Amino acid sequence: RPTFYRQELNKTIWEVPERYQNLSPVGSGAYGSVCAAFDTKTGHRVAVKKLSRPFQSIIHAKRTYRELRLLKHMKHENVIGLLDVFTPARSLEEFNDVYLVTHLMGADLNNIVKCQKLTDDHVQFLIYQILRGLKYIHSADIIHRDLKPSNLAVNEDCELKILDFRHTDDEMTGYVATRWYRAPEIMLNWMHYNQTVDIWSVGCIMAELLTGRTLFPGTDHIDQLKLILRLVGTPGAELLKKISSESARNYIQSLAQMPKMNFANVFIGANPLAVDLLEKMLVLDSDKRITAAQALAHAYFAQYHDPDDEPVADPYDQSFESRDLLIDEWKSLTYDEVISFVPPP
Ligand SMILES: O=C(c1ccco1)N1CCN(C(=O)C2CC2)CC1
Ligand SMILES: [Cl-]
Ligand SMILES: [Cl-]
Ligand SMILES: [Cl-]
Ligand SMILES: [Cl-]
Ligand SMILES: [Cl-]
């Protein structure tokens, strides 16, 4: 057991191992209770997160367990990983607080996309890295569900990682970036969705890196659907059959039919190979979208593609998701995952 020390950070008593020095808050509350620190064991600048109210309800206790299981699994160059997890508790009986430690990057994609001139080579390398990380995430049967520029971290060499492993009705309402990258089948609860929702999001991100502009900046759910159908066309009878929501199917049929637009006339002057890949990602029927594994072999990525260095994940057991347990049973499972942590090489 390391020696712990105490200090007051943001109205809060933090108790951390001596290896972590110079703690100072970051994110202005956006990430939760998170501080930058210097890690004296590794020499890295790190992020230390102190969970708030981790075991306050059955729902909160299960969310704590889910977050720690996902972060312990993810071991890939293009995905956030866990450097450490600790508690100052010396037994299950006195366990209350959980702290998570990760690498901390320089900025998110929103900072670069808003403030930089991006070449076609920059767009090739950034989207290649998102797809390499997604091939790994999807191989474990994990769905991200929230890919957007604020969840993609980058360092000065243009190397990228995927963040955020919840959302409320109020959070998805009106003129908000929280909804602009969502696939239409999840935005409007059309059907049981699957991993194809993440490829819609990558298409929206790619289009914005190419133009400097949000692809579908809707003022509300209905305005955003009208922007999507003007580009990709209204649904045909095959996709309408698959909308298992009757009232959603009825509303779609009230709209005048529109053909798919010419993407070379929308993305004026872009690499033809980028236009081709956008046409394969931004397909209304999720069964017909390109997968991450197929997209890595597309000619747009010929400069970066290496089929011997695009790894897949170990198997991930998510059977706990269908399990009904008491608060103390979720808290005991979380404790065992804290004490069993093995740090990376
Ligand atoms: O690198 C970044 C970053 C840079 C720009 C936006 O996010 N992050 C912050 C959020 N993180 C956490 O809160 C981890 C639980 C510690 C660590 C990774
Ligand atoms: Cl220490
Ligand atoms: Cl990492
Ligand atoms: Cl504790
Ligand atoms: Cl964003
Ligand atoms: Cl597992």
XYZ file of C-alpha atoms and ligand atoms in Angstrom:
368
model
C 0.000 0.000 0.000
C 1.415 3.449 -0.851
C 1.393 6.374 1.639
C -1.535 8.800 1.042
C -1.697 12.599 1.682
C -4.758 14.984 1.969
C -5.533 18.424 0.433
C -8.738 20.456 -0.215
C -9.493 20.677 -4.004
C -12.766 22.309 -5.273
C -14.757 22.228 -1.935
C -13.566 18.568 -1.666
C -10.979 16.615 0.510
C -8.738 14.591 -1.918
C -6.622 11.730 -0.497
C -4.046 10.417 -3.079
C -0.758 8.461 -3.214
C 2.480 10.556 -2.803
C 3.515 9.631 -6.403
C 0.900 12.218 -7.640
C 2.150 15.839 -7.172
C 1.068 19.458 -8.104
C -2.722 18.695 -8.325
C -4.715 21.513 -10.089
C -8.303 21.422 -11.527
C -8.942 21.276 -15.343
C -12.052 21.338 -17.643
C -13.986 24.098 -15.715
C -16.390 21.330 -14.480
C -17.015 19.786 -17.984
C -15.276 16.424 -17.091
C -16.536 16.316 -13.451
C -14.098 16.541 -10.476
C -10.851 16.141 -12.564
C -7.285 17.496 -11.878
C -4.008 17.553 -13.857
C -1.072 16.119 -11.836
C 2.585 15.127 -12.318
C 3.038 11.339 -11.949
C 6.544 10.816 -10.393
C 6.541 7.031 -11.202
C 6.020 7.440 -15.026
C 7.047 11.121 -15.666
C 3.649 11.711 -17.452
C 1.227 14.640 -16.923
C -1.990 12.770 -15.898
C -5.713 13.397 -15.210
C -6.996 12.286 -11.731
C -10.827 11.930 -11.471
C -12.549 11.636 -8.050
C -16.004 10.069 -8.605
C -18.981 11.982 -7.010
C -21.537 9.927 -5.021
C -20.395 6.611 -6.649
C -22.726 4.325 -4.508
C -25.727 6.694 -3.745
C -28.404 4.603 -5.638
C -28.644 1.134 -7.355
C -28.448 3.114 -10.672
C -25.304 5.121 -9.538
C -23.521 1.970 -8.048
C -24.075 0.076 -11.406
C -22.812 3.139 -13.456
C -19.614 3.215 -11.275
C -19.026 -0.558 -11.916
C -19.737 -0.119 -15.712
C -17.251 2.826 -16.068
C -14.439 0.929 -14.213
C -15.020 -2.316 -16.231
C -14.917 -0.407 -19.603
C -11.782 1.649 -18.704
C -9.889 -1.519 -17.425
C -10.629 -3.325 -20.756
C -9.526 -0.656 -23.287
C -5.841 -1.253 -24.358
C -5.280 0.454 -27.738
C -3.169 3.444 -29.015
C -6.302 5.315 -30.304
C -8.529 4.807 -27.168
C -8.227 6.301 -23.616
C -6.730 3.684 -21.221
C -6.472 3.369 -17.400
C -3.019 4.209 -15.922
C -4.217 3.633 -12.281
C -7.261 3.230 -10.006
C -7.098 3.658 -6.215
C -9.022 4.082 -2.958
C -7.655 5.215 0.422
C -9.915 2.557 2.091
C -8.021 -0.353 3.777
C -11.136 -2.732 3.720
C -14.552 -3.237 1.954
C -16.126 -2.029 5.265
C -14.595 1.504 4.938
C -14.769 1.741 1.042
C -16.561 4.941 -0.144
C -14.359 6.762 -2.716
C -12.952 5.803 -6.162
C -10.197 7.693 -8.078
C -9.334 7.065 -11.806
C -6.020 8.080 -13.498
C -5.424 8.503 -17.295
C -3.050 10.193 -19.777
C -4.041 13.857 -20.408
C -3.842 15.185 -24.027
C -3.236 18.837 -25.111
C -6.675 19.655 -26.567
C -9.828 18.213 -28.232
C -10.786 18.185 -31.982
C -13.090 21.237 -31.488
C -10.027 23.412 -30.662
C -8.117 22.276 -33.814
C -11.194 22.242 -36.178
C -12.270 25.763 -35.092
C -8.705 27.260 -35.110
C -6.585 25.460 -37.776
C -6.245 25.169 -41.585
C -6.551 21.385 -42.226
C -5.046 19.830 -45.394
C -6.451 16.638 -47.040
C -3.451 14.746 -45.494
C -4.533 15.979 -41.998
C -8.140 14.744 -42.661
C -6.791 11.332 -43.925
C -4.669 10.789 -40.728
C -7.285 12.010 -38.156
C -10.185 9.895 -39.652
C -7.805 6.844 -40.139
C -7.038 6.973 -36.339
C -10.783 7.265 -35.331
C -11.593 4.179 -37.565
C -8.551 2.159 -36.178
C -9.849 2.808 -32.594
C -13.500 2.008 -33.617
C -12.479 -1.328 -35.277
C -10.967 -2.255 -31.832
C -14.066 -0.962 -29.781
C -16.587 -2.762 -32.123
C -14.559 -6.089 -32.005
C -15.453 -6.204 -28.212
C -19.215 -5.594 -29.002
C -19.004 -2.123 -27.376
C -21.051 0.768 -28.981
C -19.627 4.289 -28.273
C -23.011 6.114 -28.915
C -21.518 9.665 -28.431
C -18.714 10.330 -30.968
C -18.291 14.109 -31.550
C -15.272 16.526 -31.774
C -15.279 17.245 -27.953
C -14.780 13.433 -27.297
C -11.592 13.205 -29.509
C -8.272 14.276 -27.868
C -5.153 15.162 -29.895
C -1.453 16.006 -29.186
C 0.768 18.447 -31.271
C 1.891 15.497 -33.571
C -1.828 15.005 -34.676
C -2.054 11.645 -32.742
C -5.682 11.012 -31.574
C -7.572 9.107 -28.758
C -11.367 8.456 -28.200
C -12.947 9.639 -24.858
C -16.167 9.072 -22.829
C -16.815 5.449 -21.622
C -26.163 8.823 -19.502
C -27.620 11.679 -21.682
C -30.873 13.476 -20.577
C -33.825 14.813 -22.726
C -32.937 18.453 -21.756
C -29.287 17.793 -22.884
C -30.530 16.806 -26.443
C -33.033 19.773 -26.861
C -32.675 22.655 -29.408
C -29.535 24.099 -31.127
C -26.973 21.778 -29.455
C -23.772 19.873 -30.504
C -24.908 17.042 -28.178
C -27.401 15.940 -31.006
C -25.770 17.122 -34.338
C -23.567 13.917 -34.708
C -26.329 11.337 -33.705
C -27.669 8.786 -36.250
C -31.362 9.378 -37.154
C -32.470 5.871 -35.871
C -31.236 6.720 -32.266
C -32.212 10.482 -32.420
C -35.875 9.458 -33.098
C -35.981 5.917 -31.505
C -36.871 4.251 -34.924
C -35.656 0.715 -33.998
C -33.208 -1.356 -31.887
C -29.904 0.330 -32.908
C -26.455 -1.331 -33.065
C -22.737 -0.396 -33.689
C -23.542 1.161 -37.172
C -24.654 4.335 -35.283
C -20.929 5.189 -34.663
C -20.164 5.211 -38.479
C -22.886 7.871 -39.058
C -21.071 10.033 -36.416
C -17.642 9.540 -38.156
C -19.224 10.737 -41.452
C -20.559 13.913 -39.748
C -17.025 14.560 -38.199
C -15.214 13.916 -41.552
C -17.569 16.344 -43.448
C -16.885 19.123 -40.810
C -13.009 18.653 -41.039
C -13.339 18.998 -44.917
C -15.657 22.150 -44.908
C -15.000 23.840 -41.492
C -18.851 23.812 -40.952
C -21.263 21.561 -38.966
C -22.929 19.106 -41.446
C -26.450 18.947 -39.770
C -26.738 21.930 -37.292
C -30.469 21.388 -36.518
C -32.425 23.897 -34.287
C -34.416 20.834 -32.886
C -34.985 17.062 -33.629
C -37.454 17.807 -36.559
C -35.311 20.579 -38.214
C -32.279 18.210 -37.995
C -34.239 15.306 -39.637
C -35.241 17.724 -42.525
C -31.491 18.662 -43.015
C -30.526 14.927 -43.086
C -33.302 13.871 -45.597
C -32.483 16.796 -47.992
C -28.883 15.400 -48.356
C -29.413 11.575 -48.269
C -33.052 11.376 -49.585
C -36.323 10.206 -47.984
C -36.624 6.517 -46.998
C -37.766 3.823 -49.469
C -40.222 0.954 -48.635
C -37.383 -1.393 -47.505
C -36.179 0.947 -44.722
C -39.795 2.021 -43.763
C -40.586 -1.692 -43.002
C -37.653 -1.681 -40.478
C -39.000 1.312 -38.458
C -40.760 -0.822 -35.790
C -42.217 2.409 -34.231
C -45.646 2.892 -35.962
C -46.044 6.655 -35.104
C -42.427 7.371 -36.288
C -43.186 5.469 -39.581
C -46.470 7.481 -39.979
C -44.654 10.865 -39.485
C -41.881 9.994 -42.062
C -44.624 9.227 -44.676
C -46.156 12.746 -44.207
C -43.012 14.312 -45.840
C -42.766 14.945 -49.650
C -40.332 12.455 -51.308
C -36.793 13.823 -52.112
C -33.906 12.161 -54.007
C -30.299 11.768 -52.604
C -28.134 14.852 -53.559
C -24.870 14.811 -55.688
C -22.121 14.786 -52.926
C -19.497 16.203 -55.469
C -21.770 19.369 -55.735
C -22.110 19.584 -51.864
C -18.357 18.992 -50.973
C -17.016 21.232 -53.799
C -13.309 20.625 -54.537
C -12.767 17.756 -52.047
C -10.633 14.695 -52.950
C -12.959 12.400 -55.027
C -11.865 9.462 -52.730
C -13.143 11.465 -49.659
C -16.518 12.108 -51.429
C -16.761 8.349 -52.197
C -16.139 7.373 -48.518
C -18.699 10.000 -47.255
C -21.343 8.401 -49.616
C -20.591 4.956 -47.975
C -20.836 6.258 -44.314
C -23.893 8.616 -44.646
C -26.489 5.959 -45.698
C -29.914 6.254 -44.070
C -30.414 2.405 -43.736
C -27.892 1.355 -41.011
C -27.688 -2.244 -42.435
C -26.047 -0.804 -45.649
C -23.383 1.510 -44.039
C -19.625 0.702 -44.423
C -18.115 -0.925 -41.258
C -14.893 0.327 -39.537
C -12.934 -2.803 -40.749
C -14.163 -2.229 -44.377
C -13.426 1.570 -44.198
C -9.727 1.021 -43.144
C -9.192 -0.780 -46.550
C -10.757 2.152 -48.597
C -8.303 3.816 -51.064
C -8.618 7.224 -49.213
C -6.317 5.696 -46.483
C -3.685 4.014 -48.842
C -0.840 6.109 -47.212
C -1.633 4.841 -43.598
C -3.419 1.414 -43.959
C -1.459 -1.574 -42.525
C -3.568 -4.731 -42.001
C -0.830 -6.197 -39.680
C -1.121 -3.117 -37.292
C -4.915 -2.658 -36.885
C -5.505 -4.841 -33.802
C -8.750 -6.292 -32.311
C -9.824 -6.490 -28.634
C -9.803 -9.367 -26.182
C -13.352 -10.610 -25.521
C -15.502 -8.378 -23.178
C -18.149 -10.021 -20.895
C -21.068 -7.536 -20.460
C -23.499 -10.116 -18.885
C -23.617 -7.836 -15.750
C -25.766 -5.363 -17.832
C -28.852 -7.687 -17.553
C -28.187 -8.514 -13.844
C -30.355 -7.177 -10.991
C -28.293 -6.574 -7.757
C -28.472 -4.554 -4.497
C -26.268 -1.390 -3.866
C -23.831 -3.316 -1.583
C -23.441 -6.157 -4.213
C -22.477 -3.575 -6.980
C -20.147 -1.877 -4.398
C -18.427 -5.276 -3.592
C -17.952 -6.054 -7.362
C -16.396 -2.530 -7.811
C -14.020 -3.065 -4.783
C -12.732 -6.393 -6.264
C -12.030 -4.605 -9.640
C -10.060 -1.808 -7.769
C -7.842 -4.248 -5.745
C -7.175 -6.544 -8.789
C -5.922 -3.702 -11.112
C -2.544 -4.417 -12.818
C -0.832 -1.334 -14.307
C 0.413 -1.204 -17.909
C 4.118 -1.931 -18.647
O -7.151 14.152 -22.412
C -8.223 14.573 -22.087
C -8.700 15.738 -22.801
C -8.055 16.711 -23.471
C -9.095 17.528 -24.043
C -10.282 16.977 -23.672
O -10.071 15.864 -22.896
N -8.944 13.958 -21.115
C -9.714 14.723 -20.094
C -10.785 13.860 -19.476
N -10.110 12.747 -18.736
C -10.651 12.265 -17.516
O -11.455 12.949 -16.896
C -10.214 10.927 -17.041
C -10.901 10.254 -15.867
C -9.551 10.915 -15.683
C -8.776 12.353 -19.225
C -8.584 12.567 -20.720
Cl 3.148 6.804 -3.801
Cl -4.051 6.172 -22.896
Cl -12.723 5.474 0.698
Cl -18.547 18.536 -29.908
Cl -14.425 -9.724 -19.859
